[PDB]
Structures are given as C-alpha cells and as structure tokens.
C-alpha cells in the first residue's frame, strides 16, 4: 500500500546498503501485504477453477471463496 | 609575654583520589560486513556444517 523501504542498491561495488539489515525492512514489505489484505483476500478470480473437479464439500471456510465448477459433473 | 595566645584547630584531609585511571586495554576487531551492493565473491570458505 506503498509505505515500504527501498532496501538499498547495487551501484558498482559501492557502499551504502544496509547490507543484510533490510530484513527488518524486507519483512515490513511482505508484512505490508500479507497483512494489508491480511485477514481476507480476493475470492473471485482464484475461486473459479477448482470445482471443475469432484462434488466434494470443498471447504472455502472463513476466508475468500473457492468452487465455481466452470463445468459439468454435479457442481459440488 | 604580653599577648593573649589562644589555640584553635584546622584539619586538612588531602584525599589522594585520581590514582588508577589507567585506561586498561583498548580493543577493536574488524568486520567483513554485508551490504546490498555485495557482488562476486572469490570462492568460499566454511559457510555451514
């Protein structure tokens, strides 16, 4: 959501990096996203394929959504 | 023989503090450290067991 570190750069051999410090940053970057949408997600675009497979209960529980079946055989 | 002559006291401690302060040993140790610049190593050594 755009507040994150740049985490240093490769110019020549050079110096200024943080040279392995950036984890505490690198974490926040990941820690931005996996928590920015964190308790939730987008169900629709990935919630399509699967149920083209069997009718089995196919748990979507307690986040997103899963089974669109996009094809025959019982729809699940 | 004609003057009063009374006695009074004064005390001088002369605390000697300021011994030692010898700076002991000064110690420094170099680092190979890691920045995101980095680049090509020359071979490797150790690195795990």
Tab-separated table of N, CA and C in Angstrom:
chain	number	residue	atom	x	y	z
A	1	UNK	N	0.844	-1.177	0.000
A	1	UNK	CA	0.000	0.000	0.000
A	1	UNK	C	0.882	1.229	0.000
A	2	UNK	N	2.133	1.020	-0.411
A	2	UNK	CA	3.131	2.000	-0.839
A	2	UNK	C	4.049	2.536	0.262
A	3	UNK	N	3.832	2.215	1.541
A	3	UNK	CA	4.789	2.635	2.573
A	3	UNK	C	5.664	1.428	2.866
A	4	UNK	N	6.869	1.458	2.307
A	4	UNK	CA	7.834	0.379	2.433
A	4	UNK	C	9.204	0.911	2.040
A	5	UNK	N	10.225	0.184	2.447
A	5	UNK	CA	11.589	0.601	2.190
A	5	UNK	C	11.972	0.312	0.745
A	6	UNK	N	13.007	1.002	0.292
A	6	UNK	CA	13.625	0.687	-0.983
A	6	UNK	C	14.636	-0.439	-0.854
A	7	UNK	N	15.271	-0.558	0.301
A	7	UNK	CA	16.197	-1.651	0.578
A	7	UNK	C	17.433	-1.629	-0.320
A	8	UNK	N	18.052	-0.459	-0.498
A	8	UNK	CA	19.433	-0.410	-0.959
A	8	UNK	C	19.662	-0.810	-2.401
A	9	UNK	N	20.892	-0.737	-2.893
A	9	UNK	CA	21.080	-0.804	-4.332
A	9	UNK	C	22.482	-1.285	-4.657
A	10	UNK	N	22.668	-1.664	-5.924
A	10	UNK	CA	23.817	-2.439	-6.385
A	10	UNK	C	24.928	-1.589	-7.008
A	11	UNK	N	24.864	-0.255	-6.921
A	11	UNK	CA	25.725	0.578	-7.768
A	11	UNK	C	27.175	0.162	-7.590
A	12	UNK	N	27.797	-0.243	-8.691
A	12	UNK	CA	29.133	-0.823	-8.722
A	12	UNK	C	29.306	-1.847	-7.609
A	13	UNK	N	30.466	-1.831	-6.953
A	13	UNK	CA	30.615	-2.474	-5.653
A	13	UNK	C	30.150	-1.575	-4.509
A	14	UNK	N	30.483	-0.285	-4.553
A	14	UNK	CA	29.805	0.752	-3.796
A	14	UNK	C	29.805	0.561	-2.304
A	15	UNK	N	28.996	1.335	-1.588
A	15	UNK	CA	28.844	1.046	-0.173
A	15	UNK	C	27.403	1.046	0.309
A	16	UNK	N	26.747	2.198	0.324
A	16	UNK	CA	25.541	2.292	1.117
A	16	UNK	C	24.433	1.335	0.746
A	17	UNK	N	24.083	0.454	1.684
A	17	UNK	CA	23.040	-0.555	1.530
A	17	UNK	C	22.150	-0.639	2.757
A	18	UNK	N	22.766	-1.023	3.874
A	18	UNK	CA	22.229	-1.792	4.992
A	18	UNK	C	22.589	-3.271	4.894
A	19	UNK	N	23.135	-3.706	3.759
A	19	UNK	CA	23.935	-4.926	3.654
A	19	UNK	C	23.478	-5.996	4.633
A	20	UNK	N	22.263	-6.507	4.440
A	20	UNK	CA	21.579	-7.504	5.259
A	20	UNK	C	20.789	-6.899	6.402
A	21	UNK	N	20.772	-5.583	6.545
A	21	UNK	CA	19.848	-5.031	7.522
A	21	UNK	C	18.429	-5.175	7.046
A	22	UNK	N	18.241	-5.154	5.734
A	22	UNK	CA	16.948	-4.807	5.179
A	22	UNK	C	15.851	-5.792	5.509
A	23	UNK	N	16.191	-6.892	6.159
A	23	UNK	CA	15.174	-7.852	6.515
A	23	UNK	C	14.088	-7.140	7.269
A	24	UNK	N	14.491	-6.448	8.330
A	24	UNK	CA	13.560	-5.667	9.134
A	24	UNK	C	12.746	-4.750	8.258
A	25	UNK	N	13.303	-4.357	7.119
A	25	UNK	CA	12.507	-3.741	6.074
A	25	UNK	C	11.789	-4.815	5.281
A	26	UNK	N	12.559	-5.714	4.666
A	26	UNK	CA	12.035	-6.721	3.754
A	26	UNK	C	10.830	-7.337	4.412
A	27	UNK	N	10.920	-7.561	5.714
A	27	UNK	CA	9.772	-8.088	6.427
A	27	UNK	C	8.585	-7.162	6.286
A	28	UNK	N	8.777	-5.879	6.570
A	28	UNK	CA	7.652	-4.953	6.516
A	28	UNK	C	6.982	-4.965	5.149
A	29	UNK	N	7.773	-5.058	4.079
A	29	UNK	CA	7.223	-5.143	2.731
A	29	UNK	C	6.250	-6.309	2.663
A	30	UNK	N	6.754	-7.537	2.820
A	30	UNK	CA	5.857	-8.664	2.994
A	30	UNK	C	4.847	-8.315	4.063
A	31	UNK	N	5.324	-7.838	5.214
A	31	UNK	CA	4.409	-7.531	6.305
A	31	UNK	C	3.420	-6.450	5.934
A	32	UNK	N	3.704	-5.660	4.902
A	32	UNK	CA	2.656	-4.797	4.379
A	32	UNK	C	1.514	-5.637	3.825
A	33	UNK	N	1.817	-6.479	2.837
A	33	UNK	CA	0.792	-7.140	2.041
A	33	UNK	C	0.090	-8.211	2.851
A	34	UNK	N	0.816	-9.252	3.237
A	34	UNK	CA	0.170	-10.409	3.827
A	34	UNK	C	-0.702	-9.992	4.995
A	35	UNK	N	-0.489	-8.787	5.540
A	35	UNK	CA	-1.444	-8.170	6.452
A	35	UNK	C	-2.257	-7.015	5.888
A	36	UNK	N	-1.982	-6.531	4.681
A	36	UNK	CA	-2.753	-5.381	4.205
A	36	UNK	C	-4.130	-5.791	3.720
A	37	UNK	N	-4.192	-6.894	2.988
A	37	UNK	CA	-5.402	-7.619	2.663
A	37	UNK	C	-5.582	-8.717	3.700
A	38	UNK	N	-4.734	-8.661	4.723
A	38	UNK	CA	-4.342	-9.804	5.532
A	38	UNK	C	-5.290	-10.844	6.087
A	39	UNK	N	-6.413	-10.407	6.641
A	39	UNK	CA	-7.419	-11.324	7.157
A	39	UNK	C	-8.400	-11.758	6.081
A	40	UNK	N	-8.152	-11.370	4.834
A	40	UNK	CA	-9.075	-11.541	3.738
A	40	UNK	C	-8.309	-11.672	2.446
A	41	UNK	N	-9.026	-11.632	1.326
A	41	UNK	CA	-8.411	-11.732	0.008
A	41	UNK	C	-9.418	-11.427	-1.094
A	42	UNK	N	-9.044	-11.774	-2.315
A	42	UNK	CA	-9.930	-11.749	-3.469
A	42	UNK	C	-10.356	-13.185	-3.758
A	43	UNK	N	-11.627	-13.545	-3.535
A	43	UNK	CA	-12.112	-14.891	-3.907
A	43	UNK	C	-12.409	-15.147	-5.388
A	44	UNK	N	-12.778	-14.139	-6.186
A	44	UNK	CA	-13.465	-14.404	-7.453
A	44	UNK	C	-12.540	-14.974	-8.524
A	45	UNK	N	-11.346	-14.414	-8.689
A	45	UNK	CA	-10.508	-14.825	-9.811
A	45	UNK	C	-9.821	-16.153	-9.560
A	46	UNK	N	-9.471	-16.436	-8.316
A	46	UNK	CA	-8.940	-17.738	-7.952
A	46	UNK	C	-10.018	-18.697	-7.465
A	47	UNK	N	-11.236	-18.214	-7.251
A	47	UNK	CA	-12.317	-19.041	-6.764
A	47	UNK	C	-13.090	-19.695	-7.881
A	48	UNK	N	-12.431	-19.914	-9.016
A	48	UNK	CA	-13.102	-20.383	-10.216
A	48	UNK	C	-12.762	-21.826	-10.558
A	49	UNK	N	-11.491	-22.113	-10.834
A	49	UNK	CA	-11.103	-23.403	-11.389
A	49	UNK	C	-11.720	-24.571	-10.629
A	50	UNK	N	-11.392	-24.688	-9.343
A	50	UNK	CA	-11.278	-25.989	-8.682
A	50	UNK	C	-12.459	-26.906	-8.964
A	51	UNK	N	-13.670	-26.442	-8.680
A	51	UNK	CA	-14.833	-27.322	-8.634
A	51	UNK	C	-15.155	-27.955	-9.987
A	52	UNK	N	-14.406	-27.596	-11.031
A	52	UNK	CA	-14.362	-28.456	-12.206
A	52	UNK	C	-13.976	-29.885	-11.833
A	53	UNK	N	-13.376	-30.066	-10.658
A	53	UNK	CA	-13.152	-31.359	-10.027
A	53	UNK	C	-14.412	-31.816	-9.308
A	54	UNK	N	-14.271	-32.769	-8.388
A	54	UNK	CA	-15.424	-33.509	-7.895
A	54	UNK	C	-16.385	-32.644	-7.085
A	55	UNK	N	-17.478	-33.247	-6.625
A	55	UNK	CA	-18.523	-32.528	-5.916
A	55	UNK	C	-18.204	-32.350	-4.450
A	56	UNK	N	-17.031	-32.803	-4.028
A	56	UNK	CA	-16.707	-32.938	-2.618
A	56	UNK	C	-16.845	-31.599	-1.909
A	57	UNK	N	-17.089	-31.671	-0.595
A	57	UNK	CA	-17.516	-30.499	0.158
A	57	UNK	C	-16.708	-29.257	-0.150
A	58	UNK	N	-15.401	-29.419	-0.357
A	58	UNK	CA	-14.590	-28.329	-0.875
A	58	UNK	C	-14.669	-27.119	0.042
A	59	UNK	N	-13.965	-27.157	1.173
A	59	UNK	CA	-14.077	-26.086	2.156
A	59	UNK	C	-13.496	-24.791	1.604
A	60	UNK	N	-14.322	-23.750	1.558
A	60	UNK	CA	-13.896	-22.374	1.338
A	60	UNK	C	-13.799	-21.576	2.636
A	61	UNK	N	-13.932	-22.238	3.784
A	61	UNK	CA	-14.349	-21.586	5.021
A	61	UNK	C	-13.479	-20.383	5.404
A	62	UNK	N	-14.155	-19.407	6.023
A	62	UNK	CA	-13.610	-18.345	6.868
A	62	UNK	C	-12.587	-17.491	6.164
A	63	UNK	N	-12.589	-17.513	4.836
A	63	UNK	CA	-11.928	-16.501	4.025
A	63	UNK	C	-12.154	-16.821	2.568
A	64	UNK	N	-12.106	-15.776	1.747
A	64	UNK	CA	-12.246	-15.881	0.301
A	64	UNK	C	-13.427	-16.734	-0.147
A	65	UNK	N	-13.207	-17.473	-1.223
A	65	UNK	CA	-14.218	-18.311	-1.835
A	65	UNK	C	-13.552	-19.097	-2.936
A	66	UNK	N	-14.146	-20.237	-3.264
A	66	UNK	CA	-13.341	-21.276	-3.888
A	66	UNK	C	-13.909	-21.883	-5.169
A	67	UNK	N	-15.100	-22.487	-5.101
A	67	UNK	CA	-15.523	-23.509	-6.059
A	67	UNK	C	-16.626	-22.992	-6.995
A	68	UNK	N	-16.254	-22.697	-8.251
A	68	UNK	CA	-17.192	-22.252	-9.275
A	68	UNK	C	-17.622	-23.328	-10.264
A	69	UNK	N	-16.891	-24.437	-10.344
A	69	UNK	CA	-17.190	-25.651	-11.107
A	69	UNK	C	-17.082	-25.540	-12.623
A	70	UNK	N	-17.328	-24.356	-13.189
A	70	UNK	CA	-16.935	-23.969	-14.546
A	70	UNK	C	-17.059	-25.119	-15.543
A	71	UNK	N	-17.953	-26.065	-15.258
A	71	UNK	CA	-18.033	-27.326	-15.986
A	71	UNK	C	-19.018	-28.276	-15.324
A	72	UNK	N	-19.249	-29.414	-15.958
A	72	UNK	CA	-20.266	-30.359	-15.535
A	72	UNK	C	-19.806	-31.201	-14.359
A	73	UNK	N	-20.527	-32.300	-14.127
A	73	UNK	CA	-20.360	-33.218	-13.009
A	73	UNK	C	-20.721	-32.605	-11.667
A	74	UNK	N	-22.019	-32.376	-11.472
A	74	UNK	CA	-22.669	-32.337	-10.163
A	74	UNK	C	-22.473	-31.051	-9.360
A	75	UNK	N	-21.495	-30.216	-9.712
A	75	UNK	CA	-21.467	-28.838	-9.248
A	75	UNK	C	-21.116	-28.598	-7.790
A	76	UNK	N	-21.054	-29.638	-6.970
A	76	UNK	CA	-20.481	-29.567	-5.625
A	76	UNK	C	-21.104	-28.649	-4.571
B	1	UNK	N	55.472	38.073	75.928
B	1	UNK	CA	54.822	37.847	77.207
B	1	UNK	C	53.559	38.678	77.380
B	2	UNK	N	53.257	39.580	76.453
B	2	UNK	CA	52.126	40.468	76.615
B	2	UNK	C	50.891	40.189	75.789
B	3	UNK	N	50.805	39.053	75.106
B	3	UNK	CA	49.715	38.811	74.176
B	3	UNK	C	48.925	37.565	74.562
B	4	UNK	N	47.707	37.481	74.025
B	4	UNK	CA	46.698	36.602	74.602
B	4	UNK	C	46.948	35.124	74.361
B	5	UNK	N	47.289	34.750	73.125
B	5	UNK	CA	47.641	33.364	72.825
B	5	UNK	C	46.524	32.348	73.075
B	6	UNK	N	45.572	32.252	72.149
B	6	UNK	CA	44.549	31.210	72.175
B	6	UNK	C	44.824	30.208	71.058
B	7	UNK	N	44.443	28.956	71.291
B	7	UNK	CA	44.700	27.863	70.361
B	7	UNK	C	43.409	27.429	69.685
B	8	UNK	N	43.458	27.253	68.361
B	8	UNK	CA	42.342	26.704	67.602
B	8	UNK	C	42.889	25.726	66.572
B	9	UNK	N	41.990	24.911	66.028
B	9	UNK	CA	42.358	23.770	65.206
B	9	UNK	C	41.891	23.943	63.769
B	10	UNK	N	42.674	23.389	62.849
B	10	UNK	CA	42.266	23.224	61.464
B	10	UNK	C	42.720	21.851	61.000
B	11	UNK	N	41.978	21.282	60.059
B	11	UNK	CA	42.231	19.934	59.578
B	11	UNK	C	42.302	19.928	58.059
B	12	UNK	N	43.245	19.158	57.521
B	12	UNK	CA	43.475	19.075	56.085
B	12	UNK	C	43.451	17.612	55.677
B	13	UNK	N	42.475	17.241	54.854
B	13	UNK	CA	42.283	15.834	54.527
B	13	UNK	C	43.357	15.326	53.573
B	14	UNK	N	43.577	16.030	52.463
B	14	UNK	CA	44.455	15.558	51.388
B	14	UNK	C	44.009	14.203	50.838
B	15	UNK	N	42.745	14.119	50.414
B	15	UNK	CA	42.279	12.913	49.735
B	15	UNK	C	43.026	12.752	48.420
B	16	UNK	N	43.556	11.556	48.195
B	16	UNK	CA	44.530	11.292	47.145
B	16	UNK	C	43.910	10.795	45.848
B	17	UNK	N	42.579	10.818	45.733
B	17	UNK	CA	41.894	10.160	44.626
B	17	UNK	C	42.418	10.679	43.289
B	18	UNK	N	42.327	9.838	42.263
B	18	UNK	CA	42.993	10.071	40.999
B	18	UNK	C	44.088	9.083	40.679
B	19	UNK	N	44.432	8.199	41.608
B	19	UNK	CA	45.178	7.006	41.251
B	19	UNK	C	44.312	6.109	40.373
B	20	UNK	N	44.963	5.142	39.726
B	20	UNK	CA	44.400	4.358	38.629
B	20	UNK	C	44.137	5.248	37.419
B	21	UNK	N	42.927	5.202	36.866
B	21	UNK	CA	42.635	5.855	35.590
B	21	UNK	C	43.651	5.436	34.531
B	22	UNK	N	43.893	4.134	34.442
B	22	UNK	CA	44.958	3.610	33.602
B	22	UNK	C	44.489	3.220	32.207
B	23	UNK	N	43.214	3.445	31.889
B	23	UNK	CA	42.585	3.219	30.586
B	23	UNK	C	42.563	1.743	30.210
B	24	UNK	N	43.168	0.889	31.039
B	24	UNK	CA	43.312	-0.549	30.810
B	24	UNK	C	43.705	-0.848	29.367
B	25	UNK	N	43.037	-1.801	28.731
B	25	UNK	CA	43.299	-2.151	27.345
B	25	UNK	C	42.167	-1.650	26.463
B	26	UNK	N	42.527	-1.118	25.300
B	26	UNK	CA	41.566	-0.743	24.275
B	26	UNK	C	41.596	-1.800	23.179
B	27	UNK	N	40.418	-2.192	22.706
B	27	UNK	CA	40.291	-3.375	21.866
B	27	UNK	C	39.325	-3.087	20.726
B	28	UNK	N	39.729	-3.455	19.514
B	28	UNK	CA	38.943	-3.261	18.303
B	28	UNK	C	39.143	-4.465	17.397
B	29	UNK	N	38.079	-4.853	16.700
B	29	UNK	CA	38.080	-6.037	15.852
B	29	UNK	C	37.296	-5.757	14.579
B	30	UNK	N	37.886	-6.109	13.441
B	30	UNK	CA	37.385	-5.718	12.131
B	30	UNK	C	36.227	-6.606	11.679
B	31	UNK	N	35.400	-6.056	10.784
B	31	UNK	CA	34.246	-6.758	10.240
B	31	UNK	C	34.281	-6.771	8.715
B	32	UNK	N	33.729	-7.847	8.156
B	32	UNK	CA	33.711	-8.168	6.733
B	32	UNK	C	32.415	-7.756	6.033
B	33	UNK	N	31.652	-6.824	6.605
B	33	UNK	CA	30.191	-6.861	6.650
B	33	UNK	C	29.430	-6.871	5.329
B	34	UNK	N	28.101	-6.890	5.441
B	34	UNK	CA	27.195	-7.204	4.344
B	34	UNK	C	26.339	-5.992	4.020
B	35	UNK	N	26.434	-5.518	2.786
B	35	UNK	CA	25.518	-4.520	2.264
B	35	UNK	C	24.896	-5.063	0.986
B	36	UNK	N	23.775	-4.464	0.586
B	36	UNK	CA	23.078	-4.949	-0.598
B	36	UNK	C	23.873	-4.752	-1.881
B	37	UNK	N	25.016	-4.077	-1.827
B	37	UNK	CA	25.856	-3.964	-3.007
B	37	UNK	C	26.486	-5.321	-3.276
B	38	UNK	N	27.341	-5.772	-2.361
B	38	UNK	CA	27.887	-7.131	-2.363
B	38	UNK	C	28.594	-7.367	-3.690
B	39	UNK	N	28.175	-8.326	-4.503
B	39	UNK	CA	28.865	-8.658	-5.732
B	39	UNK	C	29.615	-9.974	-5.636
B	40	UNK	N	30.460	-10.206	-6.637
B	40	UNK	CA	31.078	-11.513	-6.806
B	40	UNK	C	31.997	-11.829	-5.630
B	41	UNK	N	31.812	-12.959	-4.966
B	41	UNK	CA	32.833	-13.471	-4.052
B	41	UNK	C	33.981	-14.103	-4.826
B	42	UNK	N	35.074	-14.340	-4.113
B	42	UNK	CA	36.151	-15.195	-4.595
B	42	UNK	C	36.095	-16.499	-3.806
B	43	UNK	N	35.643	-17.560	-4.472
B	43	UNK	CA	35.399	-18.878	-3.890
B	43	UNK	C	34.528	-18.749	-2.639
B	44	UNK	N	34.772	-19.581	-1.630
B	44	UNK	CA	34.068	-19.531	-0.356
B	44	UNK	C	34.867	-20.334	0.661
B	45	UNK	N	34.560	-20.121	1.939
B	45	UNK	CA	35.136	-20.938	2.996
B	45	UNK	C	34.109	-21.114	4.102
B	46	UNK	N	34.237	-22.219	4.838
B	46	UNK	CA	33.350	-22.555	5.958
B	46	UNK	C	31.917	-22.599	5.439
B	47	UNK	N	31.016	-21.740	5.910
B	47	UNK	CA	29.666	-21.455	5.434
B	47	UNK	C	28.593	-22.415	5.955
B	48	UNK	N	28.943	-23.565	6.546
B	48	UNK	CA	27.981	-24.417	7.253
B	48	UNK	C	28.662	-25.694	7.735
B	49	UNK	N	28.004	-26.402	8.654
B	49	UNK	CA	28.307	-27.789	8.971
B	49	UNK	C	27.034	-28.474	9.447
